[PDB]
From Swiss-Prot, chain B:
Role played: Regulator subunit of pancreatic ATP-sensitive potassium channel (KATP), playing a major role in the regulation of insulin release. In pancreatic cells, it forms KATP channels with KCNJ11; KCNJ11 forms the channel pore while ABCC8 is required for activation and regulation.
Subunit structure and binding partners: Forms an heterooctamer with KCNJ11; four ABCC8/SUR1 molecules interact with one KCNJ11 homotetramer.
Organism: Homo sapiens
Disease with which this protein is associated in UniProt: Leucine-induced hypoglycemia: Rare cause of hypoglycemia and is described as a condition in which symptomatic hypoglycemia is provoked by high protein feedings. Hypoglycemia is also elicited by administration of oral or intravenous infusions of a single amino acid, leucine. Hyperinsulinemic hypoglycemia, familial, 1: A form of hyperinsulinemic hypoglycemia, a clinically and genetically heterogeneous disorder characterized by inappropriate insulin secretion from the pancreatic beta-cells in the presence of low blood glucose levels. HHF1 is the most common cause of persistent hypoglycemia in infancy. Unless early and aggressive intervention is undertaken, brain damage from recurrent episodes of hypoglycemia may occur. HHF1 inheritance can be autosomal dominant or autosomal recessive.
Entry's family note: Belongs to the ABC transporter superfamily. ABCC family. Conjugate transporter (TC 3.A.1.208) subfamily.
Phylogenetic classification of the source organism: Eukaryota, Metazoa, Chordata, Craniata, Vertebrata
Ranges per topology, Cytoplasmic: 71-129
Protein name, as recorded: ATP-binding cassette sub-family C member 8
Extracellular membrane side: 148
TM spans (from-to): 18-35, 54-70, 130-147, 149-161
Localization of this protein: Cell membrane
Complete-protein stretch covered: 996 to 1186 of 1581
Effect of residue 28 to Y: In TNDM2; overactive channel
């Protein structure tokens, strides 16, 4: 979790680790390493047990005990044979089960798209082929564990056969008392009692070795290193650490205590300026000039902690009840708290009640109002909402609550009707910022993009200021 | 005596289940036979005729060990095949309100961890359980054979074993 | 409530401080070397 | 054998404890194994159903009212709408008023306690459900992409042509972004679509809706995540290229639903109006008129 708390979020998005693999590493591989440290003194106590077994065999029945002990020292090449075969089968087992887990989590979130588009048998056939490759690896594992269990039980009665046949034959005739026979049979059986455990020990060693490989693979990844509260000037920012820079030369200037808006197309740098100003992108060049302090944030995809509704508003703030009333009257969850079975003590999320979709956006921006953090960074709060709730979130909330105590807010919105309300607007085009300033500034120079926004609002008669 | 245990034996098959319980009882019974012939042949002191019969029942112990090992892997492989793709074919035909009701991480924790436990952990638990249980009751039967006074002594240790297990199990759960 | 809190060693900070003091003495060989020096 | 039972009595009792302790996994998988059915069978014979049974978009909503489960309230009320053959009709309304459940009512996810919808003379409750959901097309607001590759995200069946993939990418207006990728139709989409943007994730999911070449498109609020210039270009290229097909659209912004032919306004699960939007704007006491004047 210390590797998690400074991890780059580009490592999640560019393949290499998924979130199911990251929680699966905790849920399985630390547990497998823990079972290896449960079974590690068994392998540290095995060879002195078998050598004081064979020297007490040399005391009890003589020199035919070494002929009987030939099969127990013959167990080490067959344990090396099943060691290399169970290692290759465990590695193929782990890679096919990781593909099956990632495909099953990828299927089970998309049940609503998959049954509607009627592709569930096709996806189930793909998971069935991944399960077929897994069952090939596990039938290999089943055969190699079978011959190790048969060898680990079948070497003892072979040792009673070689010893008790070789003593009554004429190699020696020293001791055919029952004392050496029953004492040696108990000596073979307490020699045998490690070997019932030894196969489960060595498959736990190979599960330990690939878990330590994936722990070192997870622990090697890249990490996050005038009233202008944010003054990124001239700085190139990239998603990919060896790719083309997604964000080019940007010269932004956010005014303090003042609303600014970020306008552009889809995929133009529009949340990427927020994650570059956070520092979640790695840097090619340039400089950020903060004030870093704590900045309020709600993302485009809303994220839910599985807790109560009131704990998702507060999010380890103090519970002042009056501003809590102010943010639920600003976000208008007051009609939608009574449709919950409890009030604000309804537990929500993944392991809770399934929400609406607009309500998770409203509770994430209701988390975003309640922080005292003085800089509020907002991805799209009016995407999943209608015109009534975005108008009530525009007359209250932004320009009402946070205009009063003078907190800086930036806004990222595809909806352009609130573009009258500004103090600054950042115009963007394709990873470059286009131009910066206010609306009187924007009809002054960039009249083509001003007329482009004039055409989309259908306010041709109205003056935009 | 849960119904999941009966689902486990009935999903295995009567063929492999009969091969398992039959070959496991004959394997522990010929181990009982090899030390009873060790008693009769050490206690005789017809010579080497009592080494010929020792070799020929030791070979039955060898191949009975082999058939117990291949039946415990074939039962683990057939239930690990068969408790997947009846589950997946049932959960893919499930209605949408059940996905709306139940948490997804509960279902996915069954598909990960309980499928991995049904895969890898339990057939080792089956061979160690069957070896330890039939080995302890056959050892209790043969030391019932050498002394009949141990049955009179054995019922106090069995009733305090059941009492300390009944005393422990409500703390353990 | 009936089970308690931990003792101060086996409380996770101080064995998280036994670790990376373990990596202060210096890869999966370094993983195993710091694990052996941390919990030997 | 006294020493043997002293050696193995612990393994007898602890492997009995581990067999019960791992038998709880078998109890949980048998708990999930006895779950309910969606009843995928059809009581109508598939010989009597034609191959192009959804040939013309003639949808007869007849007294349909739905609840999500059997304990709940009627979400849609007594609704009755005649949807005409090749026509482009849209629905707007308030949040939580029945808008996404109207799109779920065509596919019978949400269950109907009264009435029936009629496509082409065929009752949709009297139909096989995989043949129902194969030949009609919904696009939903939340983008659920998958990983694997772009072509598998576009068609997972391996049955479609790459020029139709490029053409559905052309009417998605994402074609310059996918052409500038160095893989470029067989590059990689990662897990959950975190390779790309939110509107690009939605735009890939719209192109997934476009590559199925059906006759009834139904849409949710699918212009909600994207830009207004791209949505105006998008409604132009979807109302030119799919002009014969019945396209049903929940509109997030109600200025793009003025170009539609008829308008349902839903409020609290009821058909408030069923008219042309020029007639609905000229009334001026309509809820659609206060929508279109409350927006701009
Ligand atoms: N998490 C990410 N990792 C790598 N590349 C990304 C990521 N997010 C976006 N990109 C790429 O960077 C470009 C810029 O996307 P960006 O995140 O700015 O979208 P956006 O315009 O903010 O989305 P929206 O239109 O929903 O606001 C996109 O073309 C996308 O392919
Ligand atoms: N999965 C669900 N289970 C039960 N009720 C739901 C579910 N989804 C939505 N509802 C209810 O159905 C009503 C209609 O909502 P919906 O059609 O989803 O959104 P809207 O009409 O606001 O776009 C809402 O009031 C909501 O409470
Ligand atoms: Mg974005
Ligand atoms: Mg809806």
């Amino acid at each position: 979790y210390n590797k998690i708390m400074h991890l780059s979020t580009s490592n999640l998005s560019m393949g290499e680790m998924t979130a199911g693999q990251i929680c699966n590493l905790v849920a399985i591989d630390t547990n497998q390493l823990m079972w290896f440290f449960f079974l590690c003194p068994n392998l540290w106590a095995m060879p002195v047990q078998i050598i004081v077994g064979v020297i007490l065999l040399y005391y009890i029945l003589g020199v035919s005990a070494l002929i009987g002990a030939a099969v127990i020292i013959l167990l080490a090449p067959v344990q090396y044979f099943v060691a290399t075969k169970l290692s290759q089968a465990q590695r193929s087992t782990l890679e096919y089960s990781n593909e099956r887990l990632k495909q099953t989590n990828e299927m089970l979130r998309g049940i609503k798209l998959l049954k509607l588009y009627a592709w569930e048998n096709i996806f189930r056939t793909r998971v069935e082929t991944t399960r077929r490759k897994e069952m090939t690896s596990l039938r290999a594992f089943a055969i190699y564990t079978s011959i190790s269990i048969f060898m680990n039980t079948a070497i003892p009665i072979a040792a009673v056969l070689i010893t008790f046949v070789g003593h009554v034959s004429f190699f020696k005739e020293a001791d055919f008392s029952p004392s050496v026979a029953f004492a040696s049979l108990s000596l073979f059986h307490i020699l045998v009692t490690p070997l019932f455990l030894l196969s489960s020990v060595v498959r736990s060693t190979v599960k330990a070795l690939v878990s330590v490989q994936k722990l070192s693979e997870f622990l090697s990844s890249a990490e996050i290193r005038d009233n202008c509260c944010v003054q990124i000037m001239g700085g190139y920012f990239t998603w990919t650490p060896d790719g083309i820079p997604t964000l080019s030369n940007i010269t932004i200037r956010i005014p303090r205590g003042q609303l600014t808006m970020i306008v552009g197309q889809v995929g133009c740098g529009k949340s990427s300026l927020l994650l570059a100003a956070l520092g979640e992108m790695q840097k090619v060049s340039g400089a950020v000039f903060w004030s870093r302090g704590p900045v309020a944030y709600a993302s485009q995809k809303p994220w839910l902690l599985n807790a109560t509704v009131e704990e998702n508003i507060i999010f380890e703030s103090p519970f002042n009840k009056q501003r809590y009333k102010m943010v639920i009257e600003a976000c208008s969850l007051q009609p939608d708290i009574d449709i919950l079975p409890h009030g604000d003590q309804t537990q929500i999320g993944e392991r809770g009640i399934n929400l609406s979709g607009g309500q998770r956006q409203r509770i994430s921006v209701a988390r975003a109002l309640y922080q005292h953090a003085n800089v509020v960074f907002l991805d799209d709060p009016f995407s999943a909402l209608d015109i009534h709730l975005s108008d009530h979130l525009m007359q209250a909330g932004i320009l009402e609550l946070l205009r009063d105590d003078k907190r800086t807010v930036v806004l990222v919105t595809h909806k352009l009707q609130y573009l009258p309300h500004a103090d600054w607007i950042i115009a963007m085009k394709d990873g470059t910022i286009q131009r910066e300033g206010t609306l009187k500034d924007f009809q002054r120079s960039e009249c083509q993009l001003f007329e482009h926004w004039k055409t989309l609002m259908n306010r041709q008669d109205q003056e935009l200021e | 005596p849960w119904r999941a245990c009966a689902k486990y034996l009935s999903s295995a098959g009567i063929l492999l289940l009969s091969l398992l319980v039959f070959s496991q009882l004959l394997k522990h019974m010929v181990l009982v036979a090899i030390d009873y012939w060790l008693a009769k042949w050490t206690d005789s002191a017809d010579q080497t005729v009592y080494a010929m019969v020792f070799t020929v029942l030791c070979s039955l112990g060898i191949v009975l060990c082999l058939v117990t090992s291949v039946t415990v892997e074939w039962t683990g492989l057939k239930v690990a095949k068969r408790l997947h793709r009846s589950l997946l074919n049932r959960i893919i035909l499930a209605p949408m309100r059940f996905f709306e009701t139940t948490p997804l991480g509960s279902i996915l924790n069954r598909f990960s961890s309980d499928c991995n436990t049904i895969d890898q952990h339990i057939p080792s638990t089956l061979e160690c359980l069957s070896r330890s249980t039939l080995l302890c009751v056959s050892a209790l039967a043969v030391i019932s054979y050498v002394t009949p006074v141990f049955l009179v002594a054995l019922l106090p240790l069995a009733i305090v074993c059941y009492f300390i297990q009944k005393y422990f199990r409500v703390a353990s759960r | 409530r009936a089970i308690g809190k931990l003792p101060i060693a086996m409380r996770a900070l101080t064995n998280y401080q036994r670790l990376c003091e373990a990596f202060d003495a210096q890869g999966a060989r370094a993983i195993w070397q710091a694990l052996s020096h941390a919990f030997g | 054998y006294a020493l043997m039972v002293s050696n193995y009595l612990n393994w007898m009792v602890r492997n009995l404890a581990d067999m019960e302790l791992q038998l709880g996994a078998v109890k949980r998988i048998h708990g999930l194994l006895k779950t309910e059915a969606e009843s995928y069978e059809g009581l109508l014979a598939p010989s009597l159903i034609p191959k192009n049974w959804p040939d013309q978009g003639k949808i007869q909503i007849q007294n349909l009212s739905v609840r999500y489960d059997s304990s709940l309230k009627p979400v849609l009320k007594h609704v009755n709408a005649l949807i005409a053959p090749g026509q482009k009709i849209g629905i707007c309304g308030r949040t939580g008023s029945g808008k996404s459940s109207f799109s779920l009512a065509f596919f019978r996810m949400v269950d109907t306690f009264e009435g029936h919808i009629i496509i082409d003379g065929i009752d949709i409750a009297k139909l096989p459900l995989h043949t129902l959901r194969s030949r009609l097309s919904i696009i939903l607001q939340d983008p659920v992409l998958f990983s694997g590759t772009i072509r598998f995200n576009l068609d997972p069946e391996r049955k479609c042509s790459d020029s139709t993939l490029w053409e559905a990418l052309e009417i998605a207006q994402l074609k310059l972004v996918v052409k500038a990728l160095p893989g470029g139709l067989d590059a990689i989409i990662t897990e959950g679509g975190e390779n790309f943007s939110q509107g690009q994730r939605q735009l890939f999911c719209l192109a997934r809706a476009f590559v199925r070449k059906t006759s009834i498109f139904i849409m949710d609020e699918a212009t909600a995540s994207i830009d207004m210039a791209t949505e105006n270009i998008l409604q132009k290229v979807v109302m030119t290229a799919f002009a014969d097909r019945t396209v049903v659209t929940i509109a997030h912004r109600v200025h793009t639903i003025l170009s539609a032919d008829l308008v349902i306004v839903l409020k609290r699960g009821a058909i408030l109006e069923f008219d042309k939007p020029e007639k609905l704007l000229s009334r001026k006491d309509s809820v659609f008129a206060s929508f279109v004047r409350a927006d701009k």
